[model samples]
Target: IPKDSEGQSFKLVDSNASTLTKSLYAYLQDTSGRQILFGHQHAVDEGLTLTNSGDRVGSTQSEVKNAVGDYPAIFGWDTLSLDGYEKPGNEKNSQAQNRANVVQSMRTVHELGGIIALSMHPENFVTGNQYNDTSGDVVKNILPDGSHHEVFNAWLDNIAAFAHELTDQSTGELIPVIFRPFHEQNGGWFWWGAQTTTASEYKALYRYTVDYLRDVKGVNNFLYAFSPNAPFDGNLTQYLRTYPGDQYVDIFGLDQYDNKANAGQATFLNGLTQDLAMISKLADEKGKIAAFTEYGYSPQGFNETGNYLQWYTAVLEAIKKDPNASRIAYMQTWANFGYPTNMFVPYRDVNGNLGGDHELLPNFVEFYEDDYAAFLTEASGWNLYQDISTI
Candidate 1:
């Protein structure tokens, strides 16, 4: 855990890397001086053969170990899927093994002095929709006849049982877990997504999940995170649905990507400012940590005018100035091959490089770095204070 200037505990930086490289860890440490949480995107069982040979496991573990070695306090693992519930097996026995696996992974990271952020994508909780299904998704129906709610409740029970098993009757230092479920709910792709479910229904589900986990299961070793996608329509109001209560949520997150269009200072600044304002307001009201859960700036060098460094700096600066902000628990960037083009439009440089495309505009990176350094100086020198007077 990292502390803000006010000594409030929080997570600062995180990223989803296919392979965690030494250079990347060193850079993160040097730049942020904070521990980083890395998510295992493609596990060993996920299937990576010699024809597609890549040191995926070695690199991931190495990255996790290196992050722990560098900033043990700031390190953790994200997205360790626990979905053995649906598979046909001795569930009780397999679940025991699953718990063991989680403990082993936590111990592995903890041995290197790191924490853990356990993220679960329980598809069984919502109506199991077909992959890429965009039609009348039946994942959030709440009518008397709808089975979605009942299924979701059972899903919650499964997760709660898992959590209880992990933390019950433990003796040694329990692994700190940040439980994030139904993440990116603001996106319309998922069945329980805000676009798919009514605001009232979403709120009920969110509250129900927390209450069941806390009261019923007696699992308290979790920091709940409510993460949503960056407003697609740019309407801040869209991000406000499904908030059960401040107590139920310990962190608020936004999933956004740089699509090269944010190449200019104004573009990057505007997006950063909007997100910061929205998140800051929510955090202030709820007394919780805020974060940019997922973001990326392409380094493809497609656009000569685009600058990754500047875009990064702008985000730092925006978080620094807002007093209601700065309690960022973790900022995680999604770095996968062909991520930018797949997620957003691609940009081209004069020499034909695949840069941030429309997501990261030209000259923004350089400007951000320059501006960020200055902001940091001011932020460091100032006696920053958080008004916990609200909640």
Candidate 2:
């Protein structure tokens, strides 16, 4: 499927490149009515570790394409470790390296017949100290103390340049690069979070980012995604604070995870549905796509019956009924590694299995098998409401 001017045609193929499997592809194609693809993770642990062959970077890329076939919509590796442009090299060189990695990754994905979703860690923009105010709370300030931070501006410029380079490569096709910076802004942990900044400041920063990238960087081949956590809290005004305007954002997403068993599942599911409804409504009002940018269900133990499968069923059911809900263009289950409760971590046990005590939940296989048939059905029928048209 081709992306329209609004970039809402985007759809997720599931994390770990699961949709790349032959059977899964057939399943999605037959049931979802929409083409599904895969997403790979590329974490930047220490500065730029492109040379670290042990990181499984290449294997992830190779497998993603091999599994998904020659589709042009793959989520690029998520870069969470590369924070700030204040690294050791000259500003231009450092920026070039960062941009080059993206280009190389995109080229790799393109060669395999796929596109990339570029994600950057918000920590790179604001320093850890600045991110957490003097009281250790996240705060946002356009000019923090009425003065610009050179490092932060440098980081923005680097991103701008990266976009410019990508646009140059893609020509006029407008390759769908889902750029999500300061994602999950509703969470107070990040520096650019809504909790820390005034609505006006957050909105301005969002606008500034888009304008700079489009105008200064000369990069227009992107679909800006504004993703937050679940539960809208029923405060439209507070929610609206995070809206980046029609011109700035093309997609809205939420990142969430259920860390406990039945109890955690209930809490996460309720929060997820509420937030999905809120975002769907907001998206309808603005004429954009809503998505689950990151999600997971942690299994406290290895009980085959009491884990991710139940959570998957809950999500699928919620999406099926809501008029504004099921139009999600993408749903990326987090497949990375981190702490027990952290949502982005993707790890494996010593024997090569994906879950253990330190991890949140297992891989996509657990849920895929349980609701395989239903997922196929929903994936195929996604475009049923496409003809309704956007506002």
Candidate 3:
């Protein structure tokens, strides 16, 4: 048996962290190396299928809920609007409206006893969008004393404003969330990615973001996460290239997706297993929670038959069967934003068939039924925000 980090305790990086935040950390620490809490990005706000009908819709139903019987344990959100970027090819919704929708979604998920994990993909302040705009050395321009410092500060202010409004309606208390800023920095797609910014610059930006939110903005409900993209090939040291420091991060996370089209199934699974083991061990040594901050079967590799139908179960088994990787606390996949093609998990049709044309219901249900997978039903019982010492 692998050595369990289950009994370990952790102190929040924020000295003035909220009671709810502290409890969440304790709950995650206790559950680590045991059950893997499931998570889905934009689980409530957007989905591939409507609840009462087979037609697709947004803000009306959840594919995860429709496929299984419950919401995921964690709800993932983003802050693209704050960075002055809008979703490409999508309707031009107002940024303020987008922020409101996110807040309401967060509230709905929180009310259902789910955790919120917020990831930011700020636009390249120098160019425009988040994708390939890489000329102006975006990171350097946004740091303190840089040409774009004021503009960048305004963006941080928007996040701080959003943080202030993240309150639980019933309890009238601030809702605790895991804030993943400057995520997937190892990838060059985003301005803060490794190719565009030095490790020192990345670290400084991350530390400043945390300090600004916690100290300057007086936000105490956030638990900072340092999550980077994977393909480290089991070389765990590379993960710390842009690591701010232990004092600034509460979670050790990796964003790894299965791009089996580029790599064979055997190779993809093997690499996932390798990286996960190292992440598990690193998190244990650092006394921080370990999680797949983001992961999914790439839509680019989607096929309607054979192994594609069993992706969920295959990934779950890979995680649970590995002694070290099994220690990961949670795994969050991408959103089913608009269509079936972009759907991460399977969705049911009006006739209750899995994805109508695609047949993944059996496999996904198997993944959900496993004792090791904690969906909302199992997650709600954890009382994650309550003092676990008494429980």
- Using TM-score as the measure, the top candidate is 3
lDDT of 3 by residue, 180-232 (tens): 98888998877788888999999999998998888999998898888888878
Pick the winner on lDDT between candidates 2 and 3. 3
Per-residue lDDT value at 86 in model 2: 22
Q: Considering TM-score, where higher is better, how would the candidates rank from best to worst?
A: 3, 2, 1
Q: What's model 1's overall lDDT? A: 0.45
Better of 2 and 3 by TM-score: 3
Q: If both were scored by lDDT, which would come out higher, candidate 1 or candidate 3?
A: 3
Q: List candidate 2 stretches off by more than 4 Å.
A: 1-40, 43-52, 55-76, 79-95, 124-145, 167-174, 233-235, 261-264, 298-309, 338-363, 366-391
Local error of candidate 2 at 165, Å?
Answer: 2.6
Off by over 4 Å in 1: 1-60, 64-80, 84-95, 124-137, 141-145, 148-154, 167-171, 232-236, 260-265, 298-314, 321-324, 335-391
Error of 1 at 375 (Å): 20
- Top of the candidates by lDDT: 3
lDDT of 2 at 88: 16
Model 3: weakest 10-residue lDDT segment is 51-60
Worst 10 residues of 2 by lDDT: 13-22
lDDT score, candidate 2, position 73 = 34
What is the TM-score of each predicted model, taking all chains together? 0.61, 0.66, 0.88
